[PDB]
């Protein structure tokens, strides 16, 4: 038979499952909704582990339970009463013999020890992967240290001593590869001559590599705390989502830099060379699976100032027209081909973050926080699972590092790019559009001629890499 449980009067987590406290989806069960007590019971269940559920819960619980209250509840979960001696144990003791204590031993082995270990695993994941709760609330950290540091008894001792050390390391807080990274490539600008760095003087292969390293680092720095609760859209977004915003602002700045490079090149032949060079950078982005970079270029080519430059795109080689068209088609039909391509490539990659943001926001906005059943309000956990499925996908692509060498000067050049200068957004984008009208006027106005601005060769070195001994 099943093990008997403590009385639900002394231990709240022994209440029977009912539709008034837990609802399952239609081989471990999947929870649709439940009270917080039932969610924590199943988070730390004696019959099975659920590591996905631990991640989902720790990522999303603050929408229904405060951090201080979560810690109180898992401490209450940990403190399980042992059963009293049975009739057979009583009779042995009355005869001066040692009792078998068979039911007590089974309850320790099959209920207390698994539940207590799974509570500690929640604590371990909480400290390792969601430490911001403790960075933001020093008293919460004190309570966790005290709880862990006072767990007695030898069955948990190895993990208690380990978790204590992990906490202490987190308070005061290296990559190996299957091969060497390729050699850094140089074109007109030579190493150390940062004053000459520009779109056409750096090597287009190395532009794409260094932007990919930068954009990969920005992608990898975004934590789920910047996403849950849609906080990057709210009034405190600069406080709560700084890494996400830095990543988006880099993408926006690079797109605007591409547009500015194009429309400030007034000579037609020179502007064709500029657009052709940006499409070559896009080709290397594709080869590197840097989809953020691909769409940075596509967004620039479809911007109002650039899209209308029919005389420029007329002279682009047909093969490059095809490269740009197939990159543009990634975004068509609500990113259908992009989503399929992302799920087929071999990482490392840099995803486009915008689709994740829209899906998190709409999941949050389109589902209720609670479900009402039999007069009770149950936490709608299915909604939280959907959000954590998205943050889990994000995290999966954050693991794999690029095998490319940083070039500190090129990296600094792109970190310091500031095409808008001190101008506000509207005056700058109006400036770009007015430049477009200047260099290719609306029909029937005639096309003017403009002098060249570049004194160095415009011929591209191409995007196939070189390899000296």
């Amino acid at each position: 038979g099943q093990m008997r449980l403590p009385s639900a009067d002394v231990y709240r987590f022994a209440e029977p499952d009912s539709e008034e406290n837990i609802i399952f989806e239609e081989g471990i069960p999947i929870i649709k909704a439940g009270t917080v007590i039932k969610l924590i019971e199943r988070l730390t269940y004696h019959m099975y582990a659920d590591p996905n559920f631990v991640r989902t819960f720790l990522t999303t619980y603050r929408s229904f339970c405060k951090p201080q209250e979560l810690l109180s509840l898992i401490i209450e979960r940990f403190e399980i009463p042992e059963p009293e001696p049975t009739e057979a144990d009583r009779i042995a003791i009355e005869n001066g013999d040692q009792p078998l204590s068979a039911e007590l031993k089974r309850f320790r082995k099959e209920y207390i020890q698994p539940v207590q270990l799974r509570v500690l695993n929640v604590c371990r994941h909480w400290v390792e992967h969601h430490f911001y709760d403790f960075e933001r609330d020093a008293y919460l950290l004190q309570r966790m240290e005290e709880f862990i540091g006072t767990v007695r008894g030898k069955a948990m001792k190895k993990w208690v001593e380990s978790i204590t050390k992990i906490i202490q390391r987190k308070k005061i807080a290296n990559i190996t590869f299957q091969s060497s990274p390729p050699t850094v490539e140089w074109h007109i600008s030579r190493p150390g001559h940062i004053e000459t760095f520009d779109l056409l003087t750096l090597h287009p292969i190395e532009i794409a590599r260094q932007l990919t390293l930068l954009e990969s680092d920005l992608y990898r720095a975004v934590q789920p705390s910047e996403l849950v609760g849609s906080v990057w859209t709210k009034e405190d977004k600069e406080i709560n989502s700084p890494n996400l915003l830095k990543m988006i602002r880099h993408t926006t700045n690079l797109t605007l830099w591409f547009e500015k490079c194009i429309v400030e090149t007034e000579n037609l032949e020179e502007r064709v060379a500029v657009v052709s060079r940006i499409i070559e950078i896009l080709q290397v982005f594709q080869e590197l699976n840097n989809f953020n970079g691909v769409l940075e270029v596509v967004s620039a080519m479809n911007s109002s100032p650039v899209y209308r430059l029919d005389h420029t795109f007329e002279q682009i080689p047909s093969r490059q027209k095809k490269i740009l068209e197939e990159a543009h088609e990634l975004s068509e039909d609500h990113y259908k081909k992009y989503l399929a391509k992302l799920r087929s490539i071999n990482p490392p990659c840099v995803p486009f973050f915008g689709i994740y943001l829209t899906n998190i926001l709409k999941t949050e906005e389109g589902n209720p926080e609670v479900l009402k059943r039999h007069g009770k309000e149950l936490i709608n956990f299915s909604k939280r699972r959907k959000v954590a499925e998205i943050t889990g996908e994000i995290q999966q692509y954050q693991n794999q590092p690029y095998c490319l060498r940083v070039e500190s000067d090129i990296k600094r050049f792109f970190e310091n790019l500031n095409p808008m200068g001190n101008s506000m957004e509207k005056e700058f984008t109006d400036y770009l559009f007015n430049k477009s009208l200047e260099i290719e006027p609306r029909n029937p106005k005639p096309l003017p001629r403009f002098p060249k601005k570049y004194s160095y060769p415009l011929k591209s070195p191409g995007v196939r890499p070189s390899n000296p001994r």
């Binding site: 859209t233 967004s299 479809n302 906005e365 389109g366 589902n367």
Partner: protein, 167 residues
């Protein structure tokens, strides 16, 4: 067979804009949503007795990707310009959204509707007369919607389709 209309929702972030398309597309009578589902943004409808397909682009949450707005907007034949009736700044943003749409579509007469969205019980700060005056100055319809009761939602989208049909 049937006509497909490509509609684009534009407007300030952080003030409940996404509720408009969610409430339209939703199982009207079950408050549930999975936006990752293929064609959670397509809906076959009957407007003035003529069946058509709406394809709705709502990039809510991507407002900080400001250099992508041109590309997103160019996909659309008609536009819902949305502000929140308790956020004056989102109302003041409407002029620049409309100017950007006109530039992207290269037309001074693009089908569009002005939508005032009630996203919570916070105090209204844009009166309906202010928004009606703005819509009239642009020559476009004005519809108010509730983010919670679905009131006005069908009217906003159907009015836009009528603007496209009568363009």
């Amino acid at each position: 067979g049937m006509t497909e209309y490509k509609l684009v929702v534009v407007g300030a972030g952080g003030v409940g804009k996404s509720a408009l398309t969610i409430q339209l597309i939703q199982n009207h009578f079950v408050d549930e949503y999975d936006p990752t589902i293929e064609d959670s943004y397509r809906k076959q409808v009957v407007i003035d007795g003529e069946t058509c397909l709406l394809d709705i682009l709502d990039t809510a949450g991507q407002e900080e990707y400001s250099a992508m707005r041109d590309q997103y907007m160019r996909t659309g034949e008609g536009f819902l310009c949305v502000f929140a009736i308790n956020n004056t700044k989102s109302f003041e943003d409407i002029h620049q959204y409309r100017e950007q749409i006109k530039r992207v579509k290269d037309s001074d007469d693009v089908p569009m509707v002005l939508v005032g969205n009630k996203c919570d019980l916070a105090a209204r700060t844009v009166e309906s007369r202010q928004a009606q005056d703005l819509a009239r100055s642009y020559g476009i319809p004005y519809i108010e919607t509730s983010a919670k009761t679905r009131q006005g939602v069908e009217d906003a989208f159907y009015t836009l389709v009528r603007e496209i049909r009568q363009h």
